[PDB]
Design an enzyme around this catalytic site. Structure first.
Site, PDB file in Angstrom:
ATOM      1  N   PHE A  22       0.822  -1.208   0.000  1.00 19.08           N
ATOM      2  CA  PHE A  22       0.000   0.000   0.000  1.00 19.08           C
ATOM      3  C   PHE A  22       0.859   1.262   0.000  1.00 19.08           C
ATOM      4  CE2 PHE A  22      -4.465  -1.362   1.052  1.00 19.08           C
ATOM      5  CZ  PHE A  22      -4.232  -2.734   0.945  1.00 19.08           C
ATOM      6  N   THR A  24       5.369   2.831   0.346  1.00 18.66           N
ATOM      7  CA  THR A  24       6.766   2.605   0.676  1.00 18.66           C
ATOM      8  C   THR A  24       7.027   2.911   2.147  1.00 18.66           C
ATOM      9  OG1 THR A  24       7.563   3.123  -1.572  1.00 18.66           O
ATOM     10  CG2 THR A  24       9.138   3.369   0.259  1.00 18.66           C
ATOM     11  N   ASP A 126      -5.536  -8.164   5.791  1.00 24.67           N
ATOM     12  CA  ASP A 126      -4.291  -8.426   5.081  1.00 24.67           C
ATOM     13  C   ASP A 126      -3.236  -9.087   5.975  1.00 24.67           C
ATOM     14  OD1 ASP A 126      -2.317  -8.403   3.099  1.00 24.67           O
ATOM     15  OD2 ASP A 126      -1.806  -6.291   3.438  1.00 24.67           O
TER      16      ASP A 126
END
Ligand SMILES: COCCO/N=C/c1c(N)ncnc1Nc1ccc2c(cnn2Cc2cccc(F)c2)c1
Length: 280
Positions: A22, A24, A126
């Site tokens: 989603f 860095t 997730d």
């Protein structure tokens, strides 16, 4: 203030940690003394600030807490730096030094963290070994919860960690999180293997419907494997509850060599790899 509004100057992105799913994530220092932090870079930010508050209002030793946010051109999420990195890379690197005691304890810890989120009615969406961080070898924590939904996870993708109902209908519940927990456990037991390695993401839902599931890890007794398989049942209500998972793995943690067979079980340093701890 629970969710501290940090100024673009109080912190600085020193080095790069890794390109996430989603955004860095960077390693850096924060000065409200300098505190080591993890910084994830991804007028309508009022929406974000909402789901952001939740991420900062959690308080459990097995769940990372969001410490601050910087709302400029982009959204930067600031949290405490976990020096050992993520669990996935950890088990891959110590594949020949990780005993049954540690493996079982991590399962217990991840389960506690997940039970905590369920109590807060927060579906991770997730969960995977890459989203479990290592504070120290005997202390792991869950992170990255909520971001999925905050970006249209269930709107009009980690297929290999998702429950069937999530792939087909974008249905996310604490029971779909239990399925991902099953996969996370598989990653630890195989010492970091990629699930369904060599199988196209597009065929995953097809193989799952036909009853195919990830194979029993070598070191696992059928008792440990039975738990994983229960987590992958089509019927979400039939899967274990995190609360039951905490109790079952805790039981196994008392007699580890009996549930995990690791030869010679009994018997790079993240200093040069990676001021006061955010905890201080
Ligand atoms: C391939 O190897 C990669 C190794 O990367 N390790 C990275 C990392 C780390 N060593 N220490 C700490 N955090 C790390 N990442 C990380 C994960 C999620 C994050 C942030 C910042 N915001 N958010 C969202 C969020 C959501 C909910 C609760 C939270 F606290 C935070 C940072």
């Amino acid at each position: 203030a629970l969710l501290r509004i940090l100024k673009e100057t109080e912190f600085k992105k020193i080095k790069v940690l890794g390109s996430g799913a989603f955004g860095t994530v960077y390693k850096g220092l924060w000065i409200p003394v300098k505190i080591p932090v993890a910084i994830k870079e991804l007028k309508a930010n009022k929406e974000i600030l909402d789901e952001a508050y939740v991420m900062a209002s959690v308080d459990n030793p097995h769940v990372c807490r969001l410490l601050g946010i910087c709302l400029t051109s982009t959204v930067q999420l600031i949290t405490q730096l976990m020096p050992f990195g993520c669990l996935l890379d950890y088990v891959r690197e110590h594949k020949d030094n990780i005993g049954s005691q540690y493996l079982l304890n991590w399962c217990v810890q991840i389960a506690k963290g997940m039970n905590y989120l369920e109590d807060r009615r927060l579906v991770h969406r997730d969960l995977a070994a890459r989203n479990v961080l290592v504070k120290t070898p005997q202390h792991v924590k869950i992170t990255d919860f909520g971001l999925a939904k905050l970006l249209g996870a269930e709107e009009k993708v980690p297929i290999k960690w998702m429950a069937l109902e999530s792939i087909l209908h974008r249905i996310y519940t604490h029971q779909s999180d239990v399925w991902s927990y099953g996969v996370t456990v598989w990653e630890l037991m195989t010492f970091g293997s990629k699930p369904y390695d060599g199988i196209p993401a597009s065929e995953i839902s097809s193989i799952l419907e036909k009853g195919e599931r990830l194979p029993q890890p070598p070191i696992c007794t059928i008792d440990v494997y039975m738990i994983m398989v229960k987590c992958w049942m089509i019927d979400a209500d039939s899967r274990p509850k995190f609360r039951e998972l905490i109790i079952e793995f805790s039981k196994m943690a008392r007699d580890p060599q009996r549930y995990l067979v690791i030869q010679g079980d009994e018997r790079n340093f993240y200093r040069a790899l990676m001021v006061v701890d955010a905890d201080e």
